[PDB]
Design a protein around this ligand. Sequence first.
Ligand code: K
Ligand code: MG
Ligand code: MG
Ligand code: MG
Ligand code: MG
Ligand code: MG
Ligand code: MG
Lengths: 195, 119, 98, 129, 81, 86
Amino acid sequence: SQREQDIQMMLAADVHLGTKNCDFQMERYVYKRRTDGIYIINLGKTWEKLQMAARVIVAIENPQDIIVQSARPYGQRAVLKFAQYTGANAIAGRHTPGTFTNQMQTSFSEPRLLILTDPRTDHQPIKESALGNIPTIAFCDTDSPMRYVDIGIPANNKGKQSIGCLFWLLARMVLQMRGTILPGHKWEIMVDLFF
Amino acid sequence: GRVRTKTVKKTSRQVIEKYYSRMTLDFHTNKKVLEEVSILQSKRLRNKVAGFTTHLMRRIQRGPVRGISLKLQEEERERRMDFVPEKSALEVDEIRVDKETMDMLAFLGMADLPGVERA
Amino acid sequence: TFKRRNGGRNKHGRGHVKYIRCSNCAKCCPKDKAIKRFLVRNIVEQAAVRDVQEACVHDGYVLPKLYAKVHHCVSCAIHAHIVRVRSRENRRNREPPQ
Amino acid sequence: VRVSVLNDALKSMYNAEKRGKRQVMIRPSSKVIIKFLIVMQKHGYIGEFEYVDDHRSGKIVVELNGRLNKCGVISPRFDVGVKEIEGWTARLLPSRQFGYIVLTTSAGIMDHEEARRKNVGGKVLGFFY
Amino acid sequence: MQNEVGDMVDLYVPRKCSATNRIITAKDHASVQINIGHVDENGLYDGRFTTFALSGFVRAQGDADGSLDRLWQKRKAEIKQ
Amino acid sequence: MVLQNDIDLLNPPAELEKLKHKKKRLVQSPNSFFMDVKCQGCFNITTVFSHSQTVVVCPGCQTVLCQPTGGKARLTEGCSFRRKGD
RNA sequence: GGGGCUCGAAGACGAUCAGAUACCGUCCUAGUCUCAACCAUAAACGAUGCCGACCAGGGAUCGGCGGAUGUUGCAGGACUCCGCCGGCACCUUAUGAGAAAUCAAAGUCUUUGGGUUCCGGGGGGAGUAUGGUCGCAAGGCUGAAACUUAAAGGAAUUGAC
Ligand SMILES: [K+]
Ligand SMILES: [Mg+2]
Ligand SMILES: [Mg+2]
Ligand SMILES: [Mg+2]
Ligand SMILES: [Mg+2]
Ligand SMILES: [Mg+2]
Ligand SMILES: [Mg+2]
């Protein structure tokens, strides 16, 4: 939709809050810091960063080899959907090592794209995707390494509202780009927020 | 000692996974069902399996465990899709904006958003 | 083979540091190298405090503390279980226990 | 102390090039540095570069295009005639197909192929390929 | 590269990273390739895309995201957005 | 802040060089200035250096203006400060 | 020359021990302290010469300075936040190096060249012989050869203890 609605929604979802510090990356994404030390990461850049991520992910027309991963047990609900709204697969919680490199493993599945809730939590799939030419997209926050993730959306991954609202917004614009959502409104009222 | 071999643990888990419909709480009913729903050679191995299954029914009658699956709450689906309120949890008015975020909305954003607040 | 980055002591930016004497064997050890502890204890322990409470003339007498900074050489500290031998990866862990 | 500003310039440029930087800063500047950079740019190994006047010694901001593998000075500036160029080519260069040696001949600062063209010799400044 | 006839002599021509221009080795398993699709004025994916390649070095550095973002901002100008 | 790959060394931001060391700026510039200190009374035209080192006086009562310190000269509370520039 | 508390090479005695000129006890001499002169060595160690440039991030700390800030039984001082220069260090990670331990320098090295001083050439003989030279002496600086030998050594690995 219009950027104003999404911006005000992530303002409602408190996606602009940062942490006490930042790494030497993401200063291209922060706006400044509050007197308490928190960061106010500029949602404006986040909007078209996730928009370009959406442009990236509707480009392969075979959504089967798109695993969404979430090691933290707080955004599992959001990753549970976004896998039947689109055709992507989604592994939640535990990621057995070898699923991207061990071709004798029962869960061997090499993707064309990886979507990750937070580079800090599930770093193991990042390091394993480094051995298979797997492009990676993650919702990095401040204090999150850029070590191998290739497209990083500057959002919050520690909030009930941030995750969920952000995932739904991404999926909404992806379906819009695919053409299924002809100009209209939301039919996916917030369900991914934690119980 | 009284710890259970991986074979009896596994077979108890499988029989509960595929035959939770009729199997009951009493040990003797569990063994008289096991003797025909599966082929166990040693009678005392069958007794161990039946007692273990009874113990896990005691475990599960209070809540779900990490072992079994199918009908994936314990017996019936549709647990969380029903948690959809008639109004979204995300409000749009007077939405949690502070001084530095006000300075942001003075930046590229629109300072006259519907949810702007002086907090 | 260098077991430790700091050499087992805490010297940087200086050349000399006066020694102390181990409280058990009276062996001269550099002040920064010696294992130093600060122990603070009641003069009388729990089995004794009960019997000294009523024996005290007035109830307003708070029981006195005692404070002692003790220094141990490496040999005495290891033999007295003040500091144990740790694994190679846990050696770098400088976090105090609890 | 700073005994050869050309070495500092070339080393900083090479270090920035290895790290994938798109711009590099060189301080202090000098005419010989400018001539070396001009030769490198003419042969198509770097791009734009601008000299900034700080009223004392000047700086250079150079734009990299990723085409430069190595570049470095030779110290001390040995004297080479026209007949010795081949030998130095066999030492400082990967292969006879490409690469360049920079000479400060009395006709100016040039590469070794141009020196052979003009049949002139001189001292060796550095090399780049 | 080029023979005196004027024909190819090497087996293949490699890819080079779109950020640092250094080439991509046949055994570079951290090197990736992203196709960014384009949309129409309404916002419909039209089936054409712009292709970028990133070598393992730039990825392992952690500058892959910044380099790709800069490349996209620069490239979208010619082909609109 | 990936690295200088996003910024331009030729045209760096105009505020980041307000904080770097004076020698380390793109072009070296002084951090000081000259100010015409105005006393409470008349004789308000005296010009003093910001990082002054001598205890200047005034023709009227010698009206001690500034004390030299490790940095900017300590102007008195009674003396008003305004700056002159190029 | 003075001083001479304590401690304590040498020495004596007790104890242990197959033996104990040692470890354990006690008494102690030179010494330990100081003044005027000599010596010139240490695991004198960061086992890492000095000067210069560049190349990742982070927080803490010491000295100085610039700015903001709002409290002190009191402009300034104490405290909080940001930044710059200089220093002692520390943490994470190589895309670097290395035989490795490990190192943000021990990196920018067969894609080898910024300047300069000292210094090594398998292990012993040996820092020995002799000469020279400084010192009251103990000793210091410089410093071989005959002969002998196939290993000596560094880092890490698995066992055994
Ligand atoms: K110690
Ligand atoms: Mg040892
Ligand atoms: Mg010092
Ligand atoms: Mg010393
Ligand atoms: Mg010596
Ligand atoms: Mg300070
Ligand atoms: Mg030898």
